[PDB]
Design an enzyme around this catalytic site. Structure first.
Site, mmCIF file in Angstrom:
data_model
loop_
_atom_site.group_PDB
_atom_site.id
_atom_site.type_symbol
_atom_site.label_atom_id
_atom_site.label_comp_id
_atom_site.label_asym_id
_atom_site.label_seq_id
_atom_site.Cartn_x
_atom_site.Cartn_y
_atom_site.Cartn_z
ATOM 1 N N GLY A 147 1.779 10.864 -16.116
ATOM 2 C CA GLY A 147 1.634 9.661 -16.911
ATOM 3 C C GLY A 147 1.247 8.477 -16.036
ATOM 4 N N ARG B 226 0.846 -1.173 0.000
ATOM 5 C CA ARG B 226 0.000 0.000 0.000
ATOM 6 C C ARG B 226 0.892 1.237 0.000
ATOM 7 N NH1 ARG B 226 -1.714 2.690 -1.971
ATOM 8 N NH2 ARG B 226 -3.128 4.411 -1.431
ATOM 9 N N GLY B 227 0.302 2.433 0.072
ATOM 10 C CA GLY B 227 1.111 3.664 0.173
ATOM 11 C C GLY B 227 1.418 3.993 1.623
ATOM 12 N N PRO B 228 0.805 5.043 2.210
ATOM 13 C CA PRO B 228 1.099 5.463 3.587
ATOM 14 C C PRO B 228 0.738 4.423 4.658
ATOM 15 C CG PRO B 228 -0.874 6.571 2.762
ATOM 16 C CD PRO B 228 -0.223 5.877 1.584
ATOM 17 N N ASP B 229 -0.308 3.623 4.432
ATOM 18 C CA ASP B 229 -0.802 2.687 5.482
ATOM 19 C C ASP B 229 0.266 1.673 5.912
ATOM 20 O OD1 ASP B 229 -3.105 4.114 4.958
ATOM 21 O OD2 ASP B 229 -4.099 2.472 3.878
ATOM 22 N N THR B 230 0.960 0.994 4.994
ATOM 23 C CA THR B 230 1.845 -0.108 5.482
ATOM 24 C C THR B 230 3.235 -0.166 4.842
ATOM 25 O OG1 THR B 230 1.855 -2.442 6.107
ATOM 26 C CG2 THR B 230 0.987 -1.922 3.917
ATOM 27 N N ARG B 231 3.552 0.706 3.883
ATOM 28 C CA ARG B 231 4.872 0.543 3.218
ATOM 29 C C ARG B 231 5.972 0.667 4.277
ATOM 30 N NH1 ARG B 231 8.992 2.536 -0.546
ATOM 31 N NH2 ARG B 231 10.249 4.023 0.652
ATOM 32 N N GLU C 286 -0.139 -2.518 -11.565
ATOM 33 C CA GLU C 286 1.131 -3.173 -11.308
ATOM 34 C C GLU C 286 0.955 -4.670 -11.082
ATOM 35 O OE1 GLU C 286 3.497 -1.104 -11.879
ATOM 36 O OE2 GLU C 286 4.713 -2.916 -12.022
#
Lengths: 170, 170, 170, 169
Positions: A43, A10-15, A77
């Site tokens: 892009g 994920r982005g902010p939650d678990t990286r 991705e």
DNA sequence: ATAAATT
DNA sequence: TTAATTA
């Protein structure tokens, strides 16, 4: 150079949490890895970095999370993930669900509906299926389930040694 | 038998402290009245009750709130009003904004928009303009705006004798 | 590619044990069937899917279950069933009681009528007879009872074999 | 000679901890009363017993239950209660909510749906309105509002001394 | 003798 | 760059 560990998150939650608990621990067993942080938004697909990654990378480890339905970049991705997998099954997928129920992947209900409904007001009318199909085809392959209660750590131990195994002996 | 004062409300967020007072307070003057009442939901255009009293009305006094957009229903009721008012300008409106300012609520911005966009994509791709061009005409005629403090008693009184003047003596 | 085998069943009462299990066993035997899961609620009984199949259908297989009463659309389904049975008796029915007793369902006794005690002031007070005529009609055709003990293994195996033999050697 | 304080109750659902407790305590003040258990079931109109008491008694005390509406026999009785009340406001009321709050009685709404919803299926679209109109009007006058935890016994006292005072004065 | 919209 | 149930 050639390494066998491509990731996601994920982005902010678990990286940050995953970098703190799994990435280092991995590096302590001598395996070159990969990941990054940038969001582009100029892009949709970065070339020979995203692509060098997916291409040369071997055994994927997509830590699906309880928000993994907001990032269009993340959605496209895992797609190319499952795509370049289905070519020569010598490289293998190792899913590790997190907090969110493994009952919410074989049909996408619960926490995702508000995500998709607004996500469906935006992008294509077709490719969305080649995403939904991929998010389907994980909820069957094997899976360390780590709930919100079990010890959210030394499962790192149990999970590294394995990724070593599928490499040492061959 | 025929009343002289129509009304309208959101539902579960002003069916208590304000409105009800106004109804009883008004009855306390020998000004036989009507109001909305049924928790019906029935139909999308019911005739032999509203559509009798509306063009049986004489003074209009809607009561906006901070969620007055959610209506799939009372919204068009407001629409029906502002339209039919245009026919015989011998009867007037006198709306009193509520809690929210009479600015962010005259151009569908602020905490008001996101409800309308939820109720804009939903139906007749032209009718949304019909609803907006209905809400617009209201926010000009003078009105005793009410905030957090103006004592909910006095305002009732000042709205009473006024409502009386344009009936008894003109 | 035409569809050859139809089903009908209460939803949340065998969406997680049998109906699936049966469908899977079937498709691993080479027979193109169809069921579905859309609750509609946009009319009475549509065409392009259910009416498509039923008329183009063939071998009927429905499954009674202890929720088989509040089927506001599915009882209709059984109606259409039995009436499209009324043209050429070269298509048959092999219904299989499940958990519910075999003979208590011929008059809606046992724990069944309590559905009806209130299911008469809602829909038409006349066509109910054309519903009960059909739900009477099954309690006659020879086949497999199932209690809570006869384990849902073999029943699958046999209930395949018959369905196939009415296709291969005629 | 004649009754003084006529009661009422739910049917069986509160013939233990409360009602009785109240009845004995009342009688320990020397204030003749009534209560009966007879089930009738030989019809629906009982005459020269309570139909004499209702036009014979004095000061009432109807109690509601968690499901008083479901009882047709007690419902119609409270009906004539309010009706032989309405002709004169010299005789009072004195209700006591119980196992239900005056949040769902000035409305016949909430847990009463199970009652009226199929209590009406047999009965006309007019009598229902009459009854409902009667049950409404209790939702006004004063309320001890005995609740879930309040000690019921402490309220028996605080409900006797009153009725005493409204007899001596 | 115990379900209802899209309030 | 946020959201309703009569299977």
């Amino acid at each position: 150079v050639e390494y066998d560990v491509f990731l996601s998150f994920r982005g902010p939650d678990t990286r940050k949490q995953f970098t703190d608990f799994l990435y280092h621990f991995l590096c302590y067993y001598k395996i070159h890895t990969f990941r990054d942080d940038d969001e582009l938004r100029k892009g949709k697909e970065i070339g020979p970095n995203l692509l060098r990654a997916i291409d040369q990378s071997k055994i994927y480890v997509p830590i699906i999370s309880s928000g993994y339905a907001d990032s269009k970049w993340c959605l496209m991705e895992l797609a190319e993930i499952v795509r370049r997998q289905e070519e020569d099954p010598r490289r293998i997928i190792l899913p590790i669900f997190y907090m969110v129920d493994p009952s919410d992947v074989r049909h996408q209900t619960g926490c995702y509906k508000k995500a998709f409904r607004k996500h469906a007001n935006k992008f294509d009318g077709q490719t969305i299926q080649n995403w939904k199909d991929a998010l389907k085809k994980v909820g069957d392959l094997k899976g360390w389930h780590i709930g919100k209660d079990d010890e959210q750590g030394a499962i790192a131990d149990k999970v590294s040694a394995d990724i070593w195994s599928h490499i040492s002996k061959e």
